[PDB]
Amino acid sequence: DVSRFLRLYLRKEGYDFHSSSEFEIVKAIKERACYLSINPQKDETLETEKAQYYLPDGSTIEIGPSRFRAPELLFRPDLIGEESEGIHEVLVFAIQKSDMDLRRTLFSNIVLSGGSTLFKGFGDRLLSEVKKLAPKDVKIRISAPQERLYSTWIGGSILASLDTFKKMWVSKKEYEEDGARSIHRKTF
Amino acid sequence: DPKYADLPGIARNEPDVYETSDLPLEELTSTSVEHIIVNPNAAYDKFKDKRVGTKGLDFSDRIGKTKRTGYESGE
Numbered sequence: 001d002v003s004r005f006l007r008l009y010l011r012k013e014g015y016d017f018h019s020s021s022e023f024e025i026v027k028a029i030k031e032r033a034c035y036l037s038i039n040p041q042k043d044e045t046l047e048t049e050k051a052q053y054y055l056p057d058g059s060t061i062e063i064g065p066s067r068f069r070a071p072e073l074l075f076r077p078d079l080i081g082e083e084s085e086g087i088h089e090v091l092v093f094a095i096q097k098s099d100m101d102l103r104r105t106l107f108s109n110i111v112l113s114g115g116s117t118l119f120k121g122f123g124d125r126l127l128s129e130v131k132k133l134a135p136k137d138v139k140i141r142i143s144a145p146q147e148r149l150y151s152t153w154i155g156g157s158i159l160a161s162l163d164t165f166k167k168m169w170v171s172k173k174e175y176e177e178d179g180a181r182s183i184h185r186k187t188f
Numbered sequence: 189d190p191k192y193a194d195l196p197g198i199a200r201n202e203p204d205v206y207e208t209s210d211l212p213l214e215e216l217t218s219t220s221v222e223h224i225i226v227n228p229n230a231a232y233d234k235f236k237d238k239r240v241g242t243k244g245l246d247f248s249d250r251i252g253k254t255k256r257t258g259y260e261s262g263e
C-alpha cells in the first residue's frame with residue numbers, strides 16, 4: 001500500500017507508472033528514496049531535497065515532498081481513505097488489550113521485523129508516536145536488528161532445528177486421517 | 189473585349205467553361221440508456237439557493253489534521 005500510494009503520487013507528478021514492471025520500479029523507489037517524517041507539518045511547510053532517481057531506461061524522476069508523504073500511510077490510513085488505525089495505534093492497542101501487570105514490560109520490549117520497517121527515520125517517529133500515546137515516563141524500548149528482513153526465516157530455522165519441532169509438527173498419516181481439524185488443533 | 193482585334197491568336201466560339209452536370213444521430217435512440225433532456229433553467233432553479241462555505245479548506249497533499257473535507261458550510 002505504501003508503494004501503491006507512491007505510484008498514485010507519481011501519477012500526479014506526471015510519470016504515469018501503470019504497468020506491472022513499472023509497479024516494481026515503484027517498489028524499488030519506495031525502498032530507496034522514501035524516508036519517514038518526524039513532524040509532517042514541520043516538513044510539509046518547507047520544501048525538501050527532491051531526490052533524482054534514475055530509471056533503468058535512463059530517464060530521470062523527481063519525487064519532491066512525496067518522498068516523505070508516501071510512507072505516511074502506515075501511521076495514518078486516512079490518507080488512502082480508510083478508517084483503520086495507524087501502526088502506532090496497532091502497537092499501543094495490542095499492548096493495552098492485554099493485562100495490566102504486563103504493560104510496562106511490553107513497553108520495554110518492542111521488537112520490530114518485517115521489511116516495511118526499514119524506512120529511514122522510521123523508529124524515531126515510532127518512538128515519538130508511542131511516547132505521545134503511552135503513559136507518562138514509561139520506558140519504551142524498541143529493538144530493531146539488522147536482519148529484520150529475515151527474522152521470521154531465521155526463527156523458522158531455529159525452531160525447526162529442534163527436537164520439540166519433531167514433537168510439534170503434523171504427521172502426514174494423521175493429516176490423512178483427519179484433515180483440516182488436525183491443523184486447526186495443532187495451530188499453536 | 190478589344191483583345192480579339194488587336195491580337196491574332198485570340199479566337200472566338202470558345203466555350204470558356206468546360207464542365208459536368210452539377211448533380212444534386214441514430215445512436216441516442218438506444219434501449220439501454222435512459223436519455224435525459226438537459227434543462228439549464230430547471231437545474232439552475234434547483235441549485236439556486238444552495239451556498240458553499242469555503243472557510244479554511246484544503247485539497248492539497250497537506251497532512252496536518254486527521255481528515256480533510258472541503259466545502260463545509262452552506263445556507
Ligand SMILES: Nc1ncnc2c1ncn2[C@@H]1O[C@H](COP(=O)(O)OP(=O)(O)O)[C@@H](O)[C@H]1O
Pocket residue numbers: 003027030031032114115116117118119120149
Ligand atoms: N530499504 C527498504 N526501505 C523501505 N521499504 C523496504 C526496504 N526493503 C524492503 N522494504 C519493503 O519491505 C517489503 C518486503 O516485504 P517483507 O517484509 O519481506 O514481507 P515478509 O517480511 O512478510 O517477507 C518490500 O516490498 C518493501 O516495500
